[PDB]
Design a protein around this nucleic acid. Sequence first.
RNA 1: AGACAACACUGACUAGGAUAGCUGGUUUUCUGCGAAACCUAUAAUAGUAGGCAAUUUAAGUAACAUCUUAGUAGGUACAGA
RNA 2: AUUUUAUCGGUGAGUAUGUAGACUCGGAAUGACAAAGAUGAAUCUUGAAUAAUCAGACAUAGAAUGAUAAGGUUGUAUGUCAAAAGGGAAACAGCCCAGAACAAGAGUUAAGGUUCCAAAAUUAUUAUUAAGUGAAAUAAAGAAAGUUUUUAUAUAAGUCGACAAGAAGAUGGGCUUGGAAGCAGCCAUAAUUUAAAGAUCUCGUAACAGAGCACUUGUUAAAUCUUAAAAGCAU
RNA 3: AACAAAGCACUUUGCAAAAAGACGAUAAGUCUAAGUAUUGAGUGUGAUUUCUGCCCGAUGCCGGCUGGUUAACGAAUUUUCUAAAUUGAAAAAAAAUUUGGUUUCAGAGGAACCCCCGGUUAAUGGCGGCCGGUCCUAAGGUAGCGAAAUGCCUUGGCCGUUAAAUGCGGUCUUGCAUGAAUGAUGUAACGAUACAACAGCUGUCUCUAUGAUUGACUCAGUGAAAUUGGAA
RNA 4: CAGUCGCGUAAGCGGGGCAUAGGAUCACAAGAUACAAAAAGGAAAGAUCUUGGAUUUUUGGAAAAGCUACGCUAGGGAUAACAGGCUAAUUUGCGCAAGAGUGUACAAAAUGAGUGCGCGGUUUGGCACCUCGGCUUGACUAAUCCUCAUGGAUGCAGAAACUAUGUAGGGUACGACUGUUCGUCGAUUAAAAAGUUACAUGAGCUGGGUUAAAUACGUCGUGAGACAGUAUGGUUUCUAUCUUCUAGAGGGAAUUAGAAUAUAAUAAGGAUUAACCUUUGUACGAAAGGAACAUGGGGUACUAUUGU
Lengths: 168, 98, 34
Amino acid sequence: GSWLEPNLNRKKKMMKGRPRVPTGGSTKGTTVVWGDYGLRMRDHHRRISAQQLKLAEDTIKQRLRGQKYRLYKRVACNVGVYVSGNEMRMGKGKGSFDHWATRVAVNQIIFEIRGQLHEQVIRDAFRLAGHKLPGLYEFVKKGDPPVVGITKLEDGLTVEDLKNPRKK
Amino acid sequence: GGLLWKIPWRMSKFQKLRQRRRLRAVDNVVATIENALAKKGETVKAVERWRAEMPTEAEMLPKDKYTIFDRKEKRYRKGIHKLPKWTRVSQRVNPPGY
Amino acid sequence: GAYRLKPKRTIPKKLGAKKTGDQYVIPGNIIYKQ
RNA sequence: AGACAACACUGACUAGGAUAGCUGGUUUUCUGCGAAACCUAUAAUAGUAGGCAAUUUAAGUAACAUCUUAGUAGGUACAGA
RNA sequence: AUUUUAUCGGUGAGUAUGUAGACUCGGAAUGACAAAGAUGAAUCUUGAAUAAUCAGACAUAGAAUGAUAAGGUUGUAUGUCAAAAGGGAAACAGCCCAGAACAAGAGUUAAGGUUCCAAAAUUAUUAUUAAGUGAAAUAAAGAAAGUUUUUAUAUAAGUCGACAAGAAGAUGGGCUUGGAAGCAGCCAUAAUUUAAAGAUCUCGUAACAGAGCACUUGUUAAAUCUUAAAAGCAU
RNA sequence: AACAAAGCACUUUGCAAAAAGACGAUAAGUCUAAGUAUUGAGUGUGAUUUCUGCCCGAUGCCGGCUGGUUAACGAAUUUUCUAAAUUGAAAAAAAAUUUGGUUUCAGAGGAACCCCCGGUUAAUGGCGGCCGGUCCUAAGGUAGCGAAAUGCCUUGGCCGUUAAAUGCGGUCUUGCAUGAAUGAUGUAACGAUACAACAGCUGUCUCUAUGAUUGACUCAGUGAAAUUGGAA
RNA sequence: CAGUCGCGUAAGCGGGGCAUAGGAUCACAAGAUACAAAAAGGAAAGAUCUUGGAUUUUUGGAAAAGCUACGCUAGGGAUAACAGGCUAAUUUGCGCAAGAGUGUACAAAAUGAGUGCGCGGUUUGGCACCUCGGCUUGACUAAUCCUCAUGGAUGCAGAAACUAUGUAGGGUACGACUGUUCGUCGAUUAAAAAGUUACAUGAGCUGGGUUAAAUACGUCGUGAGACAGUAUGGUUUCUAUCUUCUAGAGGGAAUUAGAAUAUAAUAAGGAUUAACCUUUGUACGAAAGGAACAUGGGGUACUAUUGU
Ligand SMILES: [K+]
Ligand SMILES: [K+]
Ligand SMILES: [K+]
Ligand SMILES: [K+]
Ligand SMILES: [K+]
Ligand SMILES: [Mg+2]
Ligand SMILES: [Mg+2]
Ligand SMILES: [Mg+2]
Ligand SMILES: [Mg+2]
Ligand SMILES: [Mg+2]
Ligand SMILES: [Mg+2]
Ligand SMILES: [Mg+2]
Ligand SMILES: [Mg+2]
Ligand SMILES: [Mg+2]
Ligand SMILES: [Mg+2]
Ligand SMILES: [Mg+2]
Ligand SMILES: [Mg+2]
Ligand SMILES: [Mg+2]
Ligand SMILES: [Mg+2]
Ligand SMILES: [Mg+2]
Ligand SMILES: [Mg+2]
Ligand SMILES: [Mg+2]
Ligand SMILES: [Mg+2]
Ligand SMILES: [Mg+2]
Ligand SMILES: [Mg+2]
Ligand SMILES: [Mg+2]
Ligand SMILES: [Mg+2]
Ligand SMILES: [Mg+2]
Ligand SMILES: [Mg+2]
Ligand SMILES: [Mg+2]
Ligand SMILES: [Mg+2]
Ligand SMILES: [Mg+2]
Ligand SMILES: [Mg+2]
Ligand SMILES: [Mg+2]
Ligand SMILES: [Mg+2]
Ligand SMILES: [Mg+2]
Ligand SMILES: [Mg+2]
Ligand SMILES: [Mg+2]
Ligand SMILES: [Mg+2]
Ligand SMILES: [Mg+2]
Ligand SMILES: [Mg+2]
Ligand SMILES: [Mg+2]
Ligand SMILES: [Mg+2]
Ligand SMILES: [Mg+2]
Ligand SMILES: [Mg+2]
Ligand SMILES: [Mg+2]
């Protein structure tokens, strides 16, 4: 399939669910792994649609057209969102398929980029993509430390320090 | 909703002072129990577990004394006075990172 | 149910442990349904 | 025209003979204890029955509640791929 | 017939990255069961006698559903109300305290408060804010010579600002075009000489010319006085 | 605009003891009627002009076989229990047969309705698709009418009427969902029916004003009512 | 445990199937038991055990179709339609951010794809706390149609218009069509803008729409009847107790013994429009066209002013 159209059945209805909320110190998906720069969702955990991620991709291509770059996607739309009619009454079963979506935890990377381009030219492409995506986004470089929840592990900070009851 | 539960998002300096003293009072109950048993050379699993994964008021940060974790909030924090029976239940530790 | 009602309510089978460790039993007593 | 048949007519008036799982009402004081809005069944779903169970006060208690110590069942949060 | 791929699909490998109601190799707390001991307000069981109740509501946490709307609908855990007065939340069924047998007391306290309405501090310490922001129901993204702090950094080897002058030559680079001379577009953009000067960043010409910039020197001049970022509180 | 109506049409009624129809806890009997097929009753339509098409398959009704079916009746069958007798058994013994009583089974033949055949549309009712061709039906809406009292789309198109027309009139129609005695269609005459237009007329309006009487208001006489938890 | 069968050297296993998805009584029918036998001997009809036939599928187990707008009674607001409340998906309601692109050139004069962050409570909806239009007369909001001040405008010469910032004092009319709010159109105008208020206002009016009984048409239904259909017609009650309000009074308390007359500060309301000429054919402009500022347009009286 694709990162926007999975090889799943639209008839099997999926429960709403919730995005992951790491409460045990997990940094899963909070670092740049493939590209040199990344786009991080820094505010809150959300469920992004496939039409919003497609527009974000078009915005990065429209701004970087005519140049050499490699765009990576770290999210996959594998969550079916079934919307019942707004004009319908409550009950009478679950709604029909509307669109695909993906659940993203806080401080996770959405897009990564690698190419022979200038940093400022990539900051603008991610700035525009962030403007059109739901929530607040941030520019990240490869090598930056991971994030535990909403706290960055900077200046020798470790996960065991965040778990230690004594922190004063 | 139309039913008003007027609960301010933050606490007053008077509610905070009492919170510090309630956390301080609980520490004295545990220390009094731990010291009384140590004189006899005894131990209780509940006490050994409290002194291992719970700090003292003097070791807590203000954010941990007046707020709690709430996954539904913007910044994953919430007024501790919004917890049920918050003046008679223990609450000192939140998930790491928040 | 759904657009077409389908009453689906089974009788509980109540499987699992009926006696825990170091619990006294006599002949015939069920200890575990599985 | 379901029109008229003497206040009444999709069937008058009068005397005799009803029911109502529904609504309303049910009158002095003091004292002791003190619920439920759940399950199952029902021609049921405004009802009812049996349980859980409120009460009375006798007969029992190796009763019941809680903690401690040791032991057991089971896979949630989390974490992981 | 023929070979070749930093193109598509497929297979193999990866102790690679992510994803989770019907994945759980790892794995809590809680809750559940039973044993002994201890404690306690008889709260338990049985016998006999014998009811009411069977739209519940809200809060908190976590879900399904809805539209991650509803004082919505529906489970689970806990409590209150229901059937609970009293103090706090301006007023208040459900929230925070606390369970009213009747009086007395500058009595002792809970939550909550202490300038006045109104019982009690105009009580002490260190900072921030100048907006009545706020002060018992947080409007957002965002903008910005508001202010404070911290962390880097520049400065008599003159920071910062202003002012004065300079800012070359091969060369009008080649192509394209009616024209393309740094400045429509395409390709190249090792050099050379200078205190420095992009085969060119912004205006300008039909095309030249011309005015600025990057950059260079000088003058004025700061002895806690440059610039930037982050954070806090404000606009 | 509904009912009735004159007119029109269909069915029914032979009167010999009761014409049919209606009435009669149910009859005698009465009306019909001292009537007789040009009589009476029932049903639909609704004067008259011009007209009233196709389908008898379904439903209803009528008629019809030396037919089928066919309850009662009934040729032919059958059983339970018990009494007595016979046979049998004659061992601790049933069992079988006949008869009496008692109690069951049983159906060759044998009515109407029904099955079957035919008739009937001013009987209840029905009256097509697909692309000149083709499939289907008992038959496929004929004549006429047609944005209608019928029309969702829709304020259909065009013409006339208005300074301006979702109206009204005329006209064309592929009419969601017109239609021929549940009648079709067009005039005269009639209408406190409904709609539209013109002229005149007007306080309907522009835009109200003044005047009159009776109430309203005050004094005297008489003297209600719905309503009302309590009220600063 | 008893009874008696199978397999196995034996120990032993066997009361169907690896486990989890097939309803009674009653009546009826077939076998056994030896219980009772309505005077007695029998029997009939009963009792006990085994067994069989069930969309008893509303499956703890009735043999069961509709209309009512002619409707009735008991109840519920424990479940609807109007309004209010909560919500804000949606909207014919708006704002901000970013800027693909259009604008001969040039992002931001104008214009603004698909989007993101919000406000608001007008439309259509959700929930279930709770069972129309017109006329008359207002009040309020400001997201502004006109009038007043004003920034921007290679795209502001002038004029007119565009966009935007202030600003709600006043105004926003007349007619035809439609029951209409809405909408369409005619003709004027400086302009002929919106919204909230129980989509303000029926104990103030109207009753055309919706609209019970009557009736017809079409469609649907075997039919009685029905329809978000169409058509004609169809009883609109109330003497104001209280609050508020509009007017007018009786009494009173005033620096104070009480009066007559004339009255201030102060308070509450009221009045609230726009256009033309003159200037001037001046600025501007190739021309056409055409401002701003300022003065006057009260007088066939006074006065002022312009002509003769
Ligand atoms: K026929
Ligand atoms: K026939
Ligand atoms: K025939
Ligand atoms: K026969
Ligand atoms: K025809
Ligand atoms: Mg965003
Ligand atoms: Mg409220
Ligand atoms: Mg089923
Ligand atoms: Mg009738
Ligand atoms: Mg009548
Ligand atoms: Mg008690
Ligand atoms: Mg309860
Ligand atoms: Mg039943
Ligand atoms: Mg009932
Ligand atoms: Mg495991
Ligand atoms: Mg609720
Ligand atoms: Mg109650
Ligand atoms: Mg209370
Ligand atoms: Mg207060
Ligand atoms: Mg005191
Ligand atoms: Mg005081
Ligand atoms: Mg304030
Ligand atoms: Mg060139
Ligand atoms: Mg040029
Ligand atoms: Mg005729
Ligand atoms: Mg006769
Ligand atoms: Mg007729
Ligand atoms: Mg006729
Ligand atoms: Mg017979
Ligand atoms: Mg025969
Ligand atoms: Mg005919
Ligand atoms: Mg006919
Ligand atoms: Mg009088
Ligand atoms: Mg006998
Ligand atoms: Mg049942
Ligand atoms: Mg059951
Ligand atoms: Mg009717
Ligand atoms: Mg309700
Ligand atoms: Mg200007
Ligand atoms: Mg004024
Ligand atoms: Mg209204
Ligand atoms: Mg009213
Ligand atoms: Mg009339
Ligand atoms: Mg009065
Ligand atoms: Mg005055
Ligand atoms: Mg004169």
